[PDB]
Amino acid sequence: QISVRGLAGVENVTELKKNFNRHLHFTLVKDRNVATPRDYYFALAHTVRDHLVGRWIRTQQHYYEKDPKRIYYLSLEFYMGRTLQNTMVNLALENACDEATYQLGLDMEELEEIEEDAGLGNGGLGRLAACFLDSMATLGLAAYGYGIRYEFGIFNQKICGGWQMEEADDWLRYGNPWEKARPEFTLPVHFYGRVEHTSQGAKWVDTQVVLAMPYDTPVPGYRNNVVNTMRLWSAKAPNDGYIQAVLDRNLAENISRVLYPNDNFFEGKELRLKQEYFVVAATLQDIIRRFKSSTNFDAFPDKVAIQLNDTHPSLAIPELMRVLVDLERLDWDKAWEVTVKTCAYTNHTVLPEALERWPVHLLETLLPRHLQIIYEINQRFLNRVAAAFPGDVDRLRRMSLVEEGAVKRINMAHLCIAGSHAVNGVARIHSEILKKTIFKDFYELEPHKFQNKTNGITPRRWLVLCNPGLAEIIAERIGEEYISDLDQLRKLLSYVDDEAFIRDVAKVKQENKLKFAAYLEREYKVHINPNSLFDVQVKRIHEYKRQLLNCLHVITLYNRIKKEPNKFVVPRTVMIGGKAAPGYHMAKMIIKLITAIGDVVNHDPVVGDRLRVIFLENYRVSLAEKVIPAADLSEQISTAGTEASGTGNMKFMLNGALTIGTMDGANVEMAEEAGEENFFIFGMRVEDVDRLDQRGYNAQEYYDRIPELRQIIEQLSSGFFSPKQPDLFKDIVNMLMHHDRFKVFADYEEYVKCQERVSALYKNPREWTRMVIRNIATSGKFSSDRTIAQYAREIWGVEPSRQRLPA
């Protein structure tokens, strides 16, 4: 059907249908009359998986022989989503399988909807890890993603009376065709015990052993026949009254059972620290095992790179020291040199609540040797600081890896900076903030460590796969090369004045809206006007992301409608979606507020179809793949200084939505790339937030001077939005009025005005689309291929290569 989807050979289609029938019969043990769509999905899934394996074995072989430097990406999260379409896309099978399946009388798109998301992550950070893997394979790096195989991923979100209910994401119920259990590479991981000192140095003894079993999942590059590996560890009990002993094996295996659902918030729970140590211990043995199969650790940093995705795998650092010092018997100083040259650290936040600080009484019980190593790292480090800023006792206490107070804590970020040769933020403004604020002392010590690597997304999933219509019309004009070289999108700038491209860009958008509006009605009782501006805010629910600000705009538009009912307004469907962590009380209330607003707004007959407020249930990767291509307006409205980068913001830019946003995170570079005239920027910059903090933020001031805002608070306070529980939202009004860390009211005026400007442009279809073209045409920078090539040259010291391997 469409060109970017590859060829449908007469030989390829014929082969595909014969393997499909083979899998149905032999692998699934079904026949044509008993088979359900789920059996058909599986038959196709095994049939595509067959095309990978050849390439997988051949890639792993190549690396064994070329012996290049290896990249290890350690993360507690890999937010993968569905695998099948992505695999087809990367292998050029999409049109073949579509043909092959249609010939069998099946609809492939209907089959695709059956795959569970691999929801092994929470949001931004987990999904970055997934995009990065796609980019690393596409750039032919010998890269390995390591993590944990959680049996349960992020919970599925149900709304019930407008409240979130969590249920377990049992994603493996029907099996996962993509993974390959590798029980032969099972490795022990130790916990508790105690530390003994001999003539021959420290020994870690009387430990509990947990086994770590790996599962390998293939990671195909984009049409280069490179297939890299993602290795995820599962917890198993070792084999050594009786009934109870067998049942107790579960305790050990609980380690990999469930993903912690707290995003951008640290919870200091033991089970979590076990998970962190677990993935780090098994991964280093596996790394070292591979290194020995080429005694001499001098070349270890020329053969190994370890990238820490935030501080979650920070135990890599004392653990590599432990292995090098206690087991391999290198002297401390040489070990340290090796460690620092091997490791690098990416920070993804400056929010105090999000930083990991582990109580010492935890580490002592669980990992008594690592604590020792950490103390030693601390002592030697502080000696460097003292030597460089003599007499500065205050710097010494600020820089210490150990924090004093009611409970002593280890600050893990300090550990990562000390033990890594590079530290990087994830957008330019966020890297500057780190250097000016929380890591200012560290930067003064070793300015050479600090870097920036602005985030990107993969154009495979985020354009070719979720938006074939747009990818197609881009392809008509400029060819296909841009899929692995997104900078080529600039070429589209000479088409901004082209009446036919204009008409086509608008049409692709109108189709995605028509489809999404249907998907809304088919899977939920809704009814939305598809001529309206689609105003969407999708991301995890957090105070700093300021969903509440969006709510105040929505309430304002509604109050203005009710005030002058027969005045023309640009109609809108406001969609807000995302999950709250189960313990985040405020977050759960915001979801309730949102639906409570939909109950009033969506039933007011006076409002018509001019305003619809929808909360989108179960925001997840595969839901992002649908709503983003349908979006007109992207809401990126965090308080300046709090969104480290953002990446949804890039997904929307790439898919033809315009952005209303603050000068935060990667928004700053997006607007710089498209030009600020092509972006709706409002509100405080970082500097303004600081001026406000110095004076002190008093929200009453905005409530006294802005009558439209006063009215909303009064509606909230008095029960207008919860008629049966007048006081439902006293928590929200309370927080907004007395302890808003995020200054919602301070940006409200300027947000509303900026929203009026969006509405005005939307009234002129042609000029809206031309601005769209100017955004899409400048999104090249935000390709994760660009990002990874920067990591590769500036941190890992490997050369990317876009060269095909043979099939």
| Contact in structure between 685 and 640 (CB atoms under 8 Å) | yes
**Binding partner of 50, given a copy of itself, ligand GPV, none, CB within 5-8 angstroms per partner class:** a copy of itself
What φ, ψ does residue 452 adopt, rounded to 5°? Answer: -125, 145
> Which residues of the chain form contacts with a copy of itself (CB under 8 A)?
25-26, 29-31, 36, 38, 50, 53-54, 56-57, 61, 152, 155, 166-168, 170, 173-175, 180-181, 183-184, 216, 236-237, 239-243, 245-247, 249-250, 254, 257-258, 260-261, 269, 271, 582-583
Exactly one of 17, 553, 651, 781 is catalytic; which is it? Answer: 651
Q: SS3 for 32? A: coil
Kindly state the DSSP code that residue 462 receives in the 8-state scheme.
I
**Binding partner of 646, given a copy of itself, ligand GPV, none, CB within 5-8 angstroms per partner class:** ligand GPV
CB of 98 to a copy of itself, least distance (A): 23
Task: Identify which of residues 573 and 638 has a Cβ nearer to ligand GPV in the complex.
Answer: 638
Dist CA 518 CA 594 (whole Å): 22
Strand 201-220, strand 180-181: pairing:
antiparallel
Based on the shown chain and the rule CB under 6 A, indicate whether residue 758 belongs to the binding site for ligand GPV: no
Residue 595 CB partners (closer than 8 Å, separation 6+):
159, 162, 615
Nearest in space to 628 (alpha carbons), one of 585, 676, 580, 577: 577
Based on the shown chain and the rule CB under 6 A, indicate whether residue 123 belongs to the binding site for ligand GPV: yes
577 half-sphere exposure, CB direction, 13 A CA radius:
24
Task: Identify which of residues 76 and 211 has a Cβ nearer to ligand GPV in the complex.
Answer: 76
Angle between helices 707-718 and 730-738 (to 10 degrees): 140
CB of 750 to ligand GPV, least distance (A): 22
Based on the shown chain and the rule CB under 6 A, indicate whether residue 349 belongs to the binding site for ligand GPV: yes
Which segment (119-127, 414-422, 556-564, 596-604) binds ligand GPV by CB under 6 A? 119-127
Q: SS3 for 588? A: helix
| Known active-site residue 545 | yes
- Using the Cα atoms of residue 314, residue 319, residue 325 and residue 329 in order, give the sign of their dihedral: negative
- Positions of chain breaks in the chain, given as the residue before each break (C to N > 2.5 Å): 240, 294
Other residues' Cβ atoms within 10 Å of the Cβ of residue 40:
22
Helix (H) or strand (E) holding 791: helix 784-791
- Using the Cα atoms of residue 603, residue 609, residue 614 and residue 620 in order, give the sign of their dihedral: positive
CB of 452 to ligand GPV, least distance (A): 12
Q: Per-residue DSSP letters for 662-718?
A: -S-TTHHHHHHHH-GGGSEE-S--HHHHHHHHHH---THHHHHH-HHHHHHHHHHHH
CB of 152 to a copy of itself, least distance (A): 6
**Binding partner of 180, given a copy of itself, ligand GPV, none, CB within 5-8 angstroms per partner class:** a copy of itself
Sheet containing 402-403: give its strands across.
Answer: 357-359, 409-411, 402-403
Place of tokens 């979130």: 164
| Contact in structure between 137 and 143 (CB atoms under 8 Å) | yes
Which segment (39-47, 60-68, 410-418, 640-648) binds ligand GPV by CB under 6 A? 640-648
Interface pick for ligand GPV out of 52, 128, 131, 288 (rule CB under 6 A): 128
- Provide the residue type at 712 as one letter: I
**Binding partner of 148, given a copy of itself, ligand GPV, none, CB within 5-8 angstroms per partner class:** none
CB of 544 to ligand GPV, least distance (A): 8
| Known active-site residue 236 | no
**Binding partner of 354, given ligand GPV, a copy of itself, none, CB within 5-8 angstroms per partner class:** ligand GPV
CB of 249 to ligand GPV, least distance (A): 25
Task: Identify which of residues 173 and 603 has a Cβ nearer to a copy of itself in the complex.
Answer: 173
Task: Identify which of residues 64 and 524 has a Cβ nearer to a copy of itself in the complex.
Answer: 64
Dist CA 727 CA 720 (whole Å): 10
Q: Is 291 annotated as a binding residue?
A: yes
Based on the shown chain and the rule CB under 6 A, indicate whether residue 371 belongs to the binding site for ligand GPV: no
Task: Identify which of residues 20 and 762 has a Cβ nearer to a copy of itself in the complex.
Answer: 20
Q: Is 289 annotated as a binding residue?
A: yes
Exactly one of 55, 453, 509, 540 is catalytic; which is it? Answer: 540
Q: SS3 for 524? A: coil
Q: Is 664 annotated as a binding residue?
A: no
CB of 427 to ligand GPV, least distance (A): 7
Please report, in angstroms and rounded to a whole number, the separation of the first and last CA atoms in the chain.
25
Residue 615 to residues 89, 164, 597, 653, Cα–Cα distance (Å) = 31, 11, 10, 22
Q: SS3 for 503? A: helix
Q: Is 682 annotated as a binding residue?
A: no
Q: Which residues pair with 86 in a beta bridge?
A: none
Based on the shown chain and the rule CB under 6 A, indicate whether residue 153 belongs to the binding site for ligand GPV: no
Q: Is 293 annotated as a binding residue?
A: yes
| Contact in structure between 359 and 402 (CB atoms under 8 Å) | no
Which segment (111-119, 273-281, 642-650, 689-697) binds ligand GPV by CB under 6 A? 642-650
CB of 134 to a copy of itself, least distance (A): 21
Interface pick for ligand GPV out of 644, 650, 654, 732 (rule CB under 6 A): 644
Dist CA 345 CA 419 (whole Å): 9
CB of 239 to a copy of itself, least distance (A): 5
| Known active-site residue 348 | yes
Dist CA 466 CA 489 (whole Å): 18
Kindly state the DSSP code that residue 806 receives in the 8-state scheme.
P
**Binding partner of 240, given a copy of itself, ligand GPV, none, CB within 5-8 angstroms per partner class:** a copy of itself
Task: Identify which of residues 457 and 792 has a Cβ nearer to ligand GPV in the complex.
Answer: 457
Exactly one of 274, 322, 348, 553 is catalytic; which is it? Answer: 348
Strand 402-403, strand 409-411: pairing:
antiparallel
Based on the shown chain and the rule CB under 6 A, indicate whether residue 426 belongs to the binding site for ligand GPV: yes
| Contact in structure between 430 and 669 (CB atoms under 8 Å) | no
Exactly one of 545, 592, 781, 786 is catalytic; which is it? Answer: 545
| Known active-site residue 540 | yes
Based on the shown chain and the rule CB under 6 A, indicate whether residue 537 belongs to the binding site for ligand GPV: no
CB of 65 to a copy of itself, least distance (A): 12
**Binding partner of 644, given ligand GPV, a copy of itself, none, CB within 5-8 angstroms per partner class:** ligand GPV
| Known active-site residue 257 | no
Based on the shown chain and the rule CB under 6 A, indicate whether residue 792 belongs to the binding site for ligand GPV: no
Kindly state the DSSP code that residue 78 receives in the 8-state scheme.
E
The set of long-range contacts for 477-484, using a CB threshold of 8 Å and a minimum separation of 24, is: 477/501, 480/3, 480/4, 483/4, 483/222, 483/459, 484/138, 484/222, 484/223, 484/785, 484/802
Exactly one of 231, 539, 553, 774 is catalytic; which is it? Answer: 539
Angle between helices 468-478 and 499-523 (to 10 degrees): 170
Interface pick for ligand GPV out of 117, 134, 169, 263 (rule CB under 6 A): 263
CB of 227 to a copy of itself, least distance (A): 11
Which segment (404-412, 471-479, 513-521, 639-647) binds ligand GPV by CB under 6 A? 639-647
**Binding partner of 258, given ligand GPV, a copy of itself, none, CB within 5-8 angstroms per partner class:** a copy of itself
| Known active-site residue 49 | no
Q: Is 199 annotated as a binding residue?
A: no
| Contact in structure between 137 and 230 (CB atoms under 8 Å) | no
Q: Which residues pair with 575 in a beta bridge?
A: 536, 614
Task: Identify which of residues 36 and 531 has a Cβ nearer to a copy of itself in the complex.
Answer: 36
Q: Mind telling me the catalytic residues?
A: 348, 539-540, 545, 647, 651
| Residues found near ligand GPV in the complex (CB under 6 A) | 122-125, 128, 263-264, 310, 348-349, 354, 426, 455, 643-647, 665
Residue list for the binding site: 31, 64, 289-294
Residue list for the binding site for AMP: 31, 64, 289-294
